[PDB]
Design a protein around this motif. Structure first.
Motif, PDB file in Angstrom:
ATOM      1  N   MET A   1      -5.015   4.455  -3.252  1.00 18.58           N
ATOM      2  CA  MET A   1      -4.955   5.412  -2.152  1.00 18.58           C
ATOM      3  C   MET A   1      -6.028   6.493  -2.276  1.00 18.58           C
ATOM      4  O   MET A   1      -6.657   6.865  -1.280  1.00 18.58           O
TER       5      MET A   1
ATOM      6  N   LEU B   1      -0.902  15.319   6.905  1.00 23.85           N
ATOM      7  CA  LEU B   1      -1.201  16.652   6.404  1.00 23.85           C
ATOM      8  C   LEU B   1      -1.921  17.480   7.456  1.00 23.85           C
ATOM      9  O   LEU B   1      -2.902  17.024   8.049  1.00 23.85           O
TER      10      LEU B   1
ATOM     11  N   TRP C   1      -3.088  23.050   2.487  1.00 19.06           N
ATOM     12  CA  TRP C   1      -2.440  21.904   3.110  1.00 19.06           C
ATOM     13  C   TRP C   1      -0.926  22.073   3.193  1.00 19.06           C
ATOM     14  O   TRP C   1      -0.305  22.759   2.380  1.00 19.06           O
TER      15      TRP C   1
ATOM     16  N   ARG D   1       1.430  -1.316 -11.955  1.00 20.35           N
ATOM     17  CA  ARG D   1       1.258  -1.722 -10.561  1.00 20.35           C
ATOM     18  C   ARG D   1       1.556  -0.571  -9.601  1.00 20.35           C
ATOM     19  O   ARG D   1       0.780  -0.290  -8.670  1.00 20.35           O
TER      20      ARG D   1
ATOM     21  N   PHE E   1       1.563  15.929  -1.837  1.00 20.10           N
ATOM     22  CA  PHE E   1       2.562  15.608  -0.827  1.00 20.10           C
ATOM     23  C   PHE E   1       2.887  14.122  -0.725  1.00 20.10           C
ATOM     24  O   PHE E   1       3.596  13.722   0.199  1.00 20.10           O
ATOM     25  N   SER E   2       2.415  13.304  -1.657  1.00 25.18           N
ATOM     26  CA  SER E   2       2.677  11.874  -1.597  1.00 25.18           C
ATOM     27  C   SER E   2       4.137  11.563  -1.916  1.00 25.18           C
ATOM     28  O   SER E   2       4.822  12.322  -2.603  1.00 25.18           O
ATOM     29  N   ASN E   3       4.613  10.430  -1.403  1.00 29.25           N
ATOM     30  CA  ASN E   3       5.995  10.015  -1.602  1.00 29.25           C
ATOM     31  C   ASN E   3       6.188   9.128  -2.825  1.00 29.25           C
ATOM     32  O   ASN E   3       7.307   8.676  -3.071  1.00 29.25           O
ATOM     33  N   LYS E   4       5.142   8.875  -3.597  1.00 31.19           N
ATOM     34  CA  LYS E   4       5.273   8.127  -4.834  1.00 31.19           C
ATOM     35  C   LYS E   4       5.474   9.077  -6.006  1.00 31.19           C
ATOM     36  O   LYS E   4       4.987  10.209  -6.003  1.00 31.19           O
TER      37      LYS E   4
ATOM     38  N   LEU F   1      -1.100   1.549  -7.014  1.00 25.37           N
ATOM     39  CA  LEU F   1      -0.997   1.877  -5.588  1.00 25.37           C
ATOM     40  C   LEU F   1      -1.574   3.264  -5.282  1.00 25.37           C
ATOM     41  O   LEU F   1      -2.380   3.431  -4.356  1.00 25.37           O
ATOM     42  N   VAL F   2      -1.185   4.268  -6.070  1.00 24.81           N
ATOM     43  CA  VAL F   2      -1.693   5.627  -5.888  1.00 24.81           C
ATOM     44  C   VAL F   2      -3.198   5.682  -6.135  1.00 24.81           C
ATOM     45  O   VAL F   2      -3.947   6.354  -5.403  1.00 24.81           O
TER      46      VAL F   2
ATOM     47  N   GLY G   1      -4.373  17.599  -2.219  1.00 23.13           N
ATOM     48  CA  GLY G   1      -3.327  17.722  -1.210  1.00 23.13           C
ATOM     49  C   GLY G   1      -2.531  16.442  -1.019  1.00 23.13           C
ATOM     50  O   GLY G   1      -1.296  16.464  -0.929  1.00 23.13           O
ATOM     51  N   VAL G   2      -3.226  15.305  -0.982  1.00 30.70           N
ATOM     52  CA  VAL G   2      -2.575  14.012  -0.811  1.00 30.70           C
ATOM     53  C   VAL G   2      -1.624  13.737  -1.965  1.00 30.70           C
ATOM     54  O   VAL G   2      -0.496  13.278  -1.763  1.00 30.70           O
TER      55      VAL G   2
ATOM     56  N   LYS H   1       0.840  -1.187   0.000  1.00 29.80           N
ATOM     57  CA  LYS H   1       0.000   0.000   0.000  1.00 29.80           C
ATOM     58  C   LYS H   1       0.877   1.240   0.000  1.00 29.80           C
ATOM     59  O   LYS H   1       1.936   1.256   0.630  1.00 29.80           O
ATOM     60  N   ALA H   2       0.436   2.269  -0.713  1.00 34.17           N
ATOM     61  CA  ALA H   2       1.066   3.574  -0.613  1.00 34.17           C
ATOM     62  C   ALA H   2       0.674   4.230   0.702  1.00 34.17           C
ATOM     63  O   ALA H   2      -0.448   4.066   1.185  1.00 34.17           O
ATOM     64  N   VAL H   3       1.606   4.974   1.281  1.00 33.10           N
ATOM     65  CA  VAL H   3       1.416   5.594   2.587  1.00 33.10           C
ATOM     66  C   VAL H   3       0.813   6.982   2.406  1.00 33.10           C
ATOM     67  O   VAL H   3       1.270   7.764   1.567  1.00 33.10           O
ATOM     68  N   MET H   4      -0.220   7.279   3.182  1.00 35.88           N
ATOM     69  CA  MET H   4      -0.807   8.612   3.185  1.00 35.88           C
ATOM     70  C   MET H   4       0.127   9.598   3.876  1.00 35.88           C
ATOM     71  O   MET H   4       0.683   9.281   4.929  1.00 35.88           O
ATOM     72  N   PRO H   5       0.330  10.790   3.321  1.00 36.66           N
ATOM     73  CA  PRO H   5       1.113  11.806   4.029  1.00 36.66           C
ATOM     74  C   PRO H   5       0.353  12.379   5.215  1.00 36.66           C
ATOM     75  O   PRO H   5      -0.878  12.381   5.255  1.00 36.66           O
TER      76      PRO H   5
ATOM     77  N   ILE I   1       2.608  19.595   5.221  1.00 35.80           N
ATOM     78  CA  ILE I   1       2.986  18.430   6.015  1.00 35.80           C
ATOM     79  C   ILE I   1       3.236  18.855   7.455  1.00 35.80           C
ATOM     80  O   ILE I   1       4.006  19.784   7.715  1.00 35.80           O
TER      81      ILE I   1
ATOM     82  N   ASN J   1      14.021  11.040  -2.531  1.00 40.44           N
ATOM     83  CA  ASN J   1      13.044  11.167  -1.444  1.00 40.44           C
ATOM     84  C   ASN J   1      13.700  11.444  -0.093  1.00 40.44           C
ATOM     85  O   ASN J   1      13.119  11.171   0.954  1.00 40.44           O
TER      86      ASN J   1
ATOM     87  N   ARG K   1      -8.990  17.296  -0.759  1.00 38.64           N
ATOM     88  CA  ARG K   1      -8.106  16.439   0.016  1.00 38.64           C
ATOM     89  C   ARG K   1      -7.261  15.562  -0.895  1.00 38.64           C
ATOM     90  O   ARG K   1      -6.081  15.330  -0.621  1.00 38.64           O
TER      91      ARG K   1
ATOM     92  N   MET L   1     -12.303   9.620  -2.607  1.00 37.58           N
ATOM     93  CA  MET L   1     -11.943  10.686  -1.689  1.00 37.58           C
ATOM     94  C   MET L   1     -12.340  12.041  -2.265  1.00 37.58           C
ATOM     95  O   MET L   1     -12.356  12.235  -3.481  1.00 37.58           O
TER      96      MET L   1
END
Ligand SMILES: [K+]
Ligand SMILES: [K+]
Ligand SMILES: [K+]
Ligand SMILES: [K+]
Ligand SMILES: [K+]
Ligand SMILES: [K+]
Ligand SMILES: [K+]
Ligand SMILES: [K+]
Ligand SMILES: [Mg+2]
Ligand SMILES: [Mg+2]
Ligand SMILES: [Mg+2]
Ligand SMILES: [Mg+2]
Ligand SMILES: [Mg+2]
Ligand SMILES: [Mg+2]
Ligand SMILES: [Mg+2]
Ligand SMILES: [Mg+2]
Ligand SMILES: [Mg+2]
Ligand SMILES: [Mg+2]
Ligand SMILES: [Mg+2]
Ligand SMILES: [Mg+2]
Ligand SMILES: [Mg+2]
Ligand SMILES: [Mg+2]
Ligand SMILES: [Mg+2]
Ligand SMILES: [Mg+2]
Ligand SMILES: [Mg+2]
Ligand SMILES: [Mg+2]
Ligand SMILES: [Mg+2]
Ligand SMILES: [Mg+2]
Ligand SMILES: [Mg+2]
Ligand SMILES: [Mg+2]
Ligand SMILES: [Mg+2]
Ligand SMILES: [Mg+2]
Ligand SMILES: [Mg+2]
Ligand SMILES: [Mg+2]
Ligand SMILES: [Mg+2]
Ligand SMILES: [Mg+2]
Ligand SMILES: [Mg+2]
Ligand SMILES: [Mg+2]
Ligand SMILES: [Mg+2]
Ligand SMILES: [Mg+2]
Ligand SMILES: [Mg+2]
Ligand SMILES: [Mg+2]
Ligand SMILES: [Mg+2]
Ligand SMILES: [Mg+2]
Ligand SMILES: [Mg+2]
Ligand SMILES: [Mg+2]
Ligand SMILES: [Mg+2]
Ligand SMILES: [Mg+2]
Ligand SMILES: [Mg+2]
Ligand SMILES: [Mg+2]
Ligand SMILES: [Mg+2]
Ligand SMILES: [Mg+2]
Ligand SMILES: [Mg+2]
Ligand SMILES: [Mg+2]
Ligand SMILES: [Mg+2]
Ligand SMILES: [Mg+2]
Ligand SMILES: [Mg+2]
Ligand SMILES: [Mg+2]
Ligand SMILES: [Mg+2]
Ligand SMILES: [Mg+2]
Ligand SMILES: [Mg+2]
Ligand SMILES: [Mg+2]
Ligand SMILES: [Mg+2]
Ligand SMILES: [Mg+2]
Ligand code: NA
Ligand code: NA
Ligand code: NA
Ligand code: NA
Ligand code: NA
Ligand code: NA
Ligand code: NA
Lengths: 114, 57, 128, 123
Positions: free
Chosen positions: C38, B26, B35, C30, C53-56, C34-35, C49-50, B20-24, B37, D107, C46, C42
């Motif tokens: 996520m 915020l 928004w 793939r 600031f996401s890390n992908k 994932l994104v 914003g997600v 799973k991708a991780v939610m930041p 971090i 990153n 929001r 939604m």
RNA sequence: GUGGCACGCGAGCUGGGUUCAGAACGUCGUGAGACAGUUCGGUCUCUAUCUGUUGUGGGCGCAGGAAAUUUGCGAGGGUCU
RNA sequence: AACCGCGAUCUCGGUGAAAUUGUAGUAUCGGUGAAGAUGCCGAUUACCCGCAACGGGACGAAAAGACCCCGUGAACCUUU
RNA sequence: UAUAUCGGUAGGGGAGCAUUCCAGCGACGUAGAAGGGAAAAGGGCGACUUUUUCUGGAGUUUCUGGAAAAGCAAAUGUAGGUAUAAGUAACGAUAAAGGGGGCGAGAACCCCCCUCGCCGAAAGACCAAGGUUUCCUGAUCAACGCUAAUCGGAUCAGGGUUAGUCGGGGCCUAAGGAUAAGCCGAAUGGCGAUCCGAUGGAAGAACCGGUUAAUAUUCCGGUACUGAUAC
RNA sequence: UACCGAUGGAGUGAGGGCAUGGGUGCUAAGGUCCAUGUCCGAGAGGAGAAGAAUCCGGACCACCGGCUAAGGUCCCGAAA
RNA sequence: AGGGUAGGGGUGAAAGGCUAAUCAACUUGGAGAUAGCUCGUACUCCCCGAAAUGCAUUUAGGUGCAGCCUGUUGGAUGU
RNA sequence: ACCGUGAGGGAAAGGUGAAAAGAACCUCGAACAGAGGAGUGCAAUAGACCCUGAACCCGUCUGCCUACAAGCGGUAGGAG
RNA sequence: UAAGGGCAGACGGUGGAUGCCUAGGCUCUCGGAGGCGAAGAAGGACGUGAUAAGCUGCGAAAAGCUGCGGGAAUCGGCACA
């Protein structure tokens, strides 16, 4: 002339693959796997058509046994008495009466209770 | 060393359950109304905890 | 006239859908998926914003696709969207054409490398 | 185990790590704020505050001790000139680390570390 | 102490011995070569899928949501002189 | 045997192969059996899904055994 | 109509279905053919056959007879496409990086500056072989670059190599090769002293300084020298 | 009830277990070589927990009808 | 640096070494050599249905002829 | 094309539409990178890799089932 | 409660099967003809266009030059100028 039966050859596979819907994983759609699965199932179906008769007779006998024990007899004694008196009602009808028409089953038992 | 069999789609997907991708994380910063971090400098205004940390001309 | 009638029916149907598409994005389906998982379902602000600031890496392209979808909604409804009004009602990632490459391996062997692409589709709608 | 081992090796041999800390300290003294990775800034803080404390003794001996760490005469002159008078009578805590964001290429968590007395807005 | 576990165990090790191409001695054979023999030298490949085992998490369940303290169904260890 | 350093390793961001692969919701014990069983029988045990670590089994993977025998197969070598 | 019979490997016998094309006879089709998706019905039994609808947008088909490139599940079978292992191994010498500015939509990596580190009988500078435009500049970042890239030995276009004296060739011969007169030999041909053939011998003959984005002993300014040619 | 003539087409010429009579072997072998039957091979169904040829029994198809075989009738599991 | 020796031929301070990642060479052709050996052989339903023995064989995991199957026919005889 | 010093070996690759009428212009975006529109056209889900557009393989939505359960994954029963 | 999973339907993605189509092959029939070259061949190299040439044509007279006959409005070869 050159003859290639493309459409008929594909249609045979498609017809058989309509029959393998609902199977698990590759057994539903992968064709060599699916066709292998479907034929083994057909051998099972031939065997189970024979076994179904034995299964249903066993179920009837168990229900008749319970109803006869409620009336005071056992299955073997009740069936011996019925055969001696010449009553030809089969086990399917007797089980149906035992489950759903207890008064009729009781009158049948009372007929041979002597 | 070698897979005896290929994995089924079910087995592959069951392993991928935890991918799973991780939610930041915020925060809203109600003044600037946008928004950023949490625990970082608000990159638009350049503020952090209500103080100008980075001044942009 | 058959195909003209079918096309007219489809053209009328498309007027009530608000969507955007990205085609032939040269990245892994793939990792893009994932994104997508996520941000499915939604609220749009929001989600923006997600994605910002996401890390992908794929979130950057998803953000512009989402902005395009919101603009398409705004044009088709002939008004600007309000706050918290729109949400990501559908999103999907499909695989696309693969570039095939060859990479040398020890003892003279050569192995194939697949450089994959994807398509992304985003539908927005109101939280009705 | 690393129980009670209290410094970060920073993925470097010891001489490389010491040289990098020295270069970072000179850069921070010359330009009053620098942008780095968070781990590097946290290591630099522990490295660099004793060097700033050494300016509270205005002596040739303290100047030479500081130079043994810096090896940069411009940084040494600035440090025993303006920086000393600015951080005079502050009891430690001369620096501040604030996190900013993440790099595109790898990153990495990024921050800036700055001398506190040169940020007028934060006082 | 005596045995079993593919004379337990080389996808765990080793390579002294054994199976190989070089060479030599004794013996046999006209010879190519050979041996109830001897002698010196001589590549030990594989990124662990399933199951197994040692550790460590996520989910849900346990009458609605929880913070603590606990009983012990059982399991394992210990047992020398 | 202990400890230390860096590289690999582990976690995160980017890129992304291979051998292998009949389908699998792939437990244990003793039996049985083409005579050494994840898959049969009877019991036993076992909530669903990962990650790290090791190699007992899958007669694990690899090269249609080079040993052995066979073919009125082949080649090369010897000789009264 | 009765009676009897109807498990089967190697194997023998019988009767049929589908496919491509042909002849004859009938038919269908832009008011929708073939093909593709879905659904329903049928057959002593089956191979298979009808019908409805969506897609499709131009051909197809019934019966009787004829002829075959006339039917796939396995050959460690072949081609193409796509999986699994797996977001795993790995990203190619452990010489090493840090910061500030610039440009840019985007910067760990590009450009400039400071600091640090490595080579230094080399990891610096040249000649030859080999390569063949990779050289310089402007645009471009799709593909290539084991990441990204605004960068590149990448893509496209334009430009760039200047000799009486440098190197080669022109001249000479070595090994060897091709030949003459001759010799040998089913054929194709094999030999055989002048010619070819450098890796060797002669060459007829300079340096200094400056200059380009990219050439220089070649261009320019001096200073010289050499060979032929008309008095 | 299908035995011979003549003709067209074959396949097979690695067999195995059990019982009986023997040789061989050690009156060993799931051993080996003959003979007489039988079954598996090419044979499904039932009992024996699960077993190629031991016990019962030769499957045209369908049936939610009935009687039996071997073997069984306390529960798993049909019937005291 | 140039040249020469070419296939069982060359070369070998000799290991059957080397002769373009090939050595008790490569390319093309004869050529679809031969293989009593292994593997593979595709639509449907119906009827019948073996053998793994004897004899011979440079024969023994091959084959010929009997034995045992099948189709079609004519005779009576089979158990 | 590619492979090989050489002799030599030796591929893959057809189809927009009747007609280019091959999408003026607008929107998001640094950019057609891509898309949503508008317009052309019988048709653009005929938009340049362009007729039809199957399987394997990969997704999203809806219905039902599923975290006390153990073997070729079907087959015969059978609630909700 | 579904973290995930199973089955079905619908709708997409990929990929390029199928159907339809084609002057590109294959096998022939009939009639000719059966060579080219020192007056320099076959086969090549380099050139040649207004604009770079990949093919085609042509050869410093270079996508062409002259004459006779035929014909009558477009032409300046092909790779969507
Ligand atoms: K046709
Ligand atoms: K194999
Ligand atoms: K026998
Ligand atoms: K004989
Ligand atoms: K079309
Ligand atoms: K058409
Ligand atoms: K499709
Ligand atoms: K089941
Ligand atoms: Mg019965
Ligand atoms: Mg995971
Ligand atoms: Mg990519
Ligand atoms: Mg990122
Ligand atoms: Mg190599
Ligand atoms: Mg390290
Ligand atoms: Mg052992
Ligand atoms: Mg080993
Ligand atoms: Mg082992
Ligand atoms: Mg020897
Ligand atoms: Mg040694
Ligand atoms: Mg690991
Ligand atoms: Mg990673
Ligand atoms: Mg056992
Ligand atoms: Mg077991
Ligand atoms: Mg197994
Ligand atoms: Mg093995
Ligand atoms: Mg073998
Ligand atoms: Mg029968
Ligand atoms: Mg039959
Ligand atoms: Mg229609
Ligand atoms: Mg065929
Ligand atoms: Mg086929
Ligand atoms: Mg294999
Ligand atoms: Mg793994
Ligand atoms: Mg590697
Ligand atoms: Mg790694
Ligand atoms: Mg050098
Ligand atoms: Mg350059
Ligand atoms: Mg440039
Ligand atoms: Mg790249
Ligand atoms: Mg360039
Ligand atoms: Mg000469
Ligand atoms: Mg230069
Ligand atoms: Mg024989
Ligand atoms: Mg025999
Ligand atoms: Mg025996
Ligand atoms: Mg057999
Ligand atoms: Mg029998
Ligand atoms: Mg009875
Ligand atoms: Mg009972
Ligand atoms: Mg030898
Ligand atoms: Mg060699
Ligand atoms: Mg021949
Ligand atoms: Mg052959
Ligand atoms: Mg033969
Ligand atoms: Mg029969
Ligand atoms: Mg015979
Ligand atoms: Mg771009
Ligand atoms: Mg369509
Ligand atoms: Mg299409
Ligand atoms: Mg329990
Ligand atoms: Mg449950
Ligand atoms: Mg679901
Ligand atoms: Mg589809
Ligand atoms: Mg001329
Ligand atoms: Na001797
Ligand atoms: Na509670
Ligand atoms: Na037949
Ligand atoms: Na050089
Ligand atoms: Na050169
Ligand atoms: Na457009
Ligand atoms: Na689910």
């Amino acid at each position: 002339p050159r003859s290639v039966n493309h459409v008929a050859s594909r249609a045979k596979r498609k017809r058989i693959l309509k029959l393998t819907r609902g199977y698990f994983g590759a057994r539903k759609n992968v064709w060599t796997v699916a066709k292998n699965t479907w034929e083994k199932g057909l051998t099972y179906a031939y065997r189970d058509r024979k076994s179904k008769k034995r299964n249903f007779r066993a179920l009837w006998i168990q229900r008749i046994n319970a109803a006869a024990r409620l009336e005071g007899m056992s299955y073997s004694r009740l069936m011996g008495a019925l055969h001696a008196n010449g009553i030809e009602i089969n086990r399917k009808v007797l089980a149906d009466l035992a489950m759903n028409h207890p008064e009729a089953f009781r009158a049948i038992v009372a007929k041979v209770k002597n | 060393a070698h897979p005896k069999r290929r994995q089924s789609k079910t087995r592959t997907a069951k392993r991928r359950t935890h991918d799973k991708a991780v939610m930041p994380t915020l925060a809203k910063c109600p003044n600037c109304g946008a928004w950023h971090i949490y625990h970082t400098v608000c990159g638009d205004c350049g503020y952090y905890r209500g103080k100008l940390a980075i001044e942009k001309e | 006239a058959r195909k003209h009638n079918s096309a007219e029916a489809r053209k009328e149907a498309l007027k009530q859908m608000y969507f955007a598409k990205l085609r032939n994005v040269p990245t892994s389906p793939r990792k893009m998926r994932l994104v997508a998982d996520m941000i499915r379902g939604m609220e749009v602000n929001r989600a923006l914003g997600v994605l910002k600031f996401s890390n992908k890496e794929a979130s950057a392209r998803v953000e512009k696709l989402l902005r395009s979808a919101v603009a398409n909604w705004e044009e088709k409804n002939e008004r600007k969207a309000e706050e918290g009004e729109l949400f990501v009602s559908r999103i999907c990632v499909d695989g696309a054409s693969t570039l095939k490459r060859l990479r040398p391996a020890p003892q003279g062997r050569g192995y194939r490398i697949r450089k994959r692409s994807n398509h992304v589709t985003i539908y927005v709608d109101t939280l009705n | 185990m690393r129980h009670n081992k209290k410094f970060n090796h920073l993925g470097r041999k010891a001489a490389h790590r010491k040289a990098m800390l020295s270069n970072m300290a000179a850069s921070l003294i010359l330009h009053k704020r620098i942008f780095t990775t968070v781990a590097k800034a946290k290591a630099l803080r522990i490295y660099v505050e004793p060097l700033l404390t050494k300016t509270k003794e205005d002596t040739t001996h303290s100047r030479r001790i500081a130079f043994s760490y810096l090896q940069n005469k411009y940084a040494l002159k600035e440090l025993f000139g303006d920086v000393a008078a600015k951080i005079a009578d502050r009891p430690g805590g001369y620096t501040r680390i604030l996190k900013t964001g993440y790099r595109l290429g790898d990153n990495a968590a990024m921050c800036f570390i700055e001398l506190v007395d040169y940020n007028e807005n934060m006082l």
